[PDB]
Amino acid sequence: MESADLRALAKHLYDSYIKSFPLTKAKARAILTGKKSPFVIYDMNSLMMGEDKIKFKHITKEVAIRIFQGCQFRSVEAVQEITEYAKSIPGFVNLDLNDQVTLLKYGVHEIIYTMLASLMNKDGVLISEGQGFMTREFLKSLRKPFGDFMEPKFEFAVKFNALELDDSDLAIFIAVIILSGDRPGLLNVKPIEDIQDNLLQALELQLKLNHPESSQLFAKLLQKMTDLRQIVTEHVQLLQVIKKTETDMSLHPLLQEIYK
Amino acid sequence: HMESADLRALAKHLYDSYIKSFPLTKAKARAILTGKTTDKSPFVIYDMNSLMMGEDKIKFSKEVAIRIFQGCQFRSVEAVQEITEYAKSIPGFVNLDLNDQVTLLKYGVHEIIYTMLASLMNKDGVLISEGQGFMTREFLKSLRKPFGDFMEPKFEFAVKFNALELDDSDLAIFIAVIILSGDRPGLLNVKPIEDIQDNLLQALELQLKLNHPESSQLFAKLLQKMTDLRQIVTEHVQLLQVIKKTETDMSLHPLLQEIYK
Ligand SMILES: O=C(O)c1ccc(-c2nn(Cc3c(Cl)cccc3C(F)(F)F)c3ccc(Cl)cc23)c(OCc2ccccc2)c1
Ligand SMILES: O=C(O)c1ccc(-c2nn(Cc3c(Cl)cccc3C(F)(F)F)c3ccc(Cl)cc23)c(OCc2ccccc2)c1
Numbered sequence: 001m002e003s004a005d006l007r008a009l010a011k012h013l014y015d016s017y018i019k020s021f022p023l024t025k026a027k028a029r030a031i032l033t034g035k036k037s038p039f040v041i042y043d044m045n046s047l048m049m050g051e052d053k054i055k056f057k058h059i060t061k062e063v064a065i066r067i068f069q070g071c072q073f074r075s076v077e078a079v080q081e082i083t084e085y086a087k088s089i090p091g092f093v094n095l096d097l098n099d100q101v102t103l104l105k106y107g108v109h110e111i112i113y114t115m116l117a118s119l120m121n122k123d124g125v126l127i128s129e130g131q132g133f134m135t136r137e138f139l140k141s142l143r144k145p146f147g148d149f150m151e152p153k154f155e156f157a158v159k160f161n162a163l164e165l166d167d168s169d170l171a172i173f174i175a176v177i178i179l180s181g182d183r184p185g186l187l188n189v190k191p192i193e194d195i196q197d198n199l200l201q202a203l204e205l206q207l208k209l210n211h212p213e214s215s216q217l218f219a220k221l222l223q224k225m226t227d228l229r230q231i232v233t234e235h236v237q238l239l240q241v242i243k244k245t246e247t248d249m250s251l252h253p254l255l256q257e258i259y260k
Numbered sequence: 261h262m263e264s265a266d267l268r269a270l271a272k273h274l275y276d277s278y279i280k281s282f283p284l285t286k287a288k289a290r291a292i293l294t295g296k297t298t299d300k301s302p303f304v305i306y307d308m309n310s311l312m313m314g315e316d317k318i319k320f321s322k323e324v325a326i327r328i329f330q331g332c333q334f335r336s337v338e339a340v341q342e343i344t345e346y347a348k349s350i351p352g353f354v355n356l357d358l359n360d361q362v363t364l365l366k367y368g369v370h371e372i373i374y375t376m377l378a379s380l381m382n383k384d385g386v387l388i389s390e391g392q393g394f395m396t397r398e399f400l401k402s403l404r405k406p407f408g409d410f411m412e413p414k415f416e417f418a419v420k421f422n423a424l425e426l427d428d429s430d431l432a433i434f435i436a437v438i439i440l441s442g443d444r445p446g447l448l449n450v451k452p453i454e455d456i457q458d459n460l461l462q463a464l465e466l467q468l469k470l471n472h473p474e475s476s477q478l479f480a481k482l483l484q485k486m487t488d489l490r491q492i493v494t495e496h497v498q499l500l501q502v503i504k505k506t507e508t509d510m511s512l513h514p515l516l517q518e519i520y521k
Pocket of ligand 1: 072073116127139149153
């Protein structure tokens, strides 16, 4: 590829990434630092006032369940956002339809965790397009398996955010995740890896121009995909504990199907 | 109101999801029904013995009409699942109130099943087991007690509906328009549902015009078919409640159980 083409590909993805995702990293960092202040959830009572404040649809019997299920609601929303962005990656829509489904089926969890760090600091997480803020303290302190469902995400995000990537970096990074040629059941891997080679090239040039003073940031960011695979697995294994433990969770079969 | 280029994009988006979500497309169904091919020919079920040989051919305990009736329930549940997956891809649907999401599907899945079952039908019968079987209308109509005429209303609608000669790219938008109906009982926020339907209706009008330029007023004719569906769903529901209060032997799947509450 030629450098001018990698600049063009990077700009393409950044523009799409902004249109696809409601709350950008740049905007989220403005809210967390205090630069319109969000509503803060730190305990039982402020949660009760919050679902009365903005009427969170993710939030509205037991508290720890309602919070867990609110993550699912927002996760379903996010999957669709990623699916739209995926269509703007040059070459993606020309792939075999089964392979498009396969790449998204397996990539979304890694991409959600990555983008969830954009909404997080060491003390909590933004919610509802940045109008809320749920504290790490409150999440960590939830009961039984829910307390320890939330804390691993924060632990990844604090390390990941130490890289100080911006939205133009992340757009290419997320694209690289989607075009992973090692997902189970892919029919035609060659054109997928061909796109990933171009995206990898663009990420490399992007990180060098946008962080010239950061030695081997490219390599350091590819090593975070090691983390991602591990956390996604830990995440999956945790869901199956709730399914086989919680008699409270049985919901509406239709909702169950939406969240399948 | 949108720009034509944006409506074509929405049409292309929905057709692509429809392909990804529904295994047996109308295009594939018509190829098997038309024949000519030797690699796709179905095994045909027209009586007791060919049904018995059929479960040995296609791999499709108790009484025949029941086993047949149960084969429809199984496939309906799968259909509910497929429609739910398609719905999530409709831009804006998953962003709606959670109650309304459930509500739109509760009432819409039957109208959509009937519509898409027409794709699997001609005047003589229906494809089964992902198009590997074909059961004759004659055979269904001749089932006993209340089950005989349980199957027949579907055929009556399908023969008329297939006369519009829609293809999958048209049906994709049509199905979406059905789901995002703002006049379903118990919806909390009709406005955001209606704004989505305006976009889907806009997309449908443009799609039908480009893809059937010589089909005068096909848009309006296709909306007048949404009238039929509402009537057939009611007759269907009322017939199940007869079976439920007659066959205590038989039992319904929880997903369908809930949809009719
Ligand atoms: O606005 C966003 O971009 C956004 C994305 C992700 C989360 C979120 N998801 N999950 C669990 C999870 C993950 Cl991580 C990945 C796939 C599927 C799921 C699951 F289980 F929900 F299905 C979390 C677990 C812990 C935390 Cl603090 C956040 C998440 C999100 O939450 C914001 C949120 C937190 C509390 C209550 C409501 C909403 C937002
Ligand atoms: O391949 C498909 O996409 C497909 C979809 C629908 C049917 C089918 N369902 N039903 C009854 C029904 C309806 Cl209509 C809606 C909700 C719930 C139910 C019920 F009662 F079963 F719970 C039928 C009644 C009459 C007819 Cl000829 C078809 C159907 C279907 O059958 C194909 C089929 C016919 C025989 C044996 C096995 C499968 C297929």
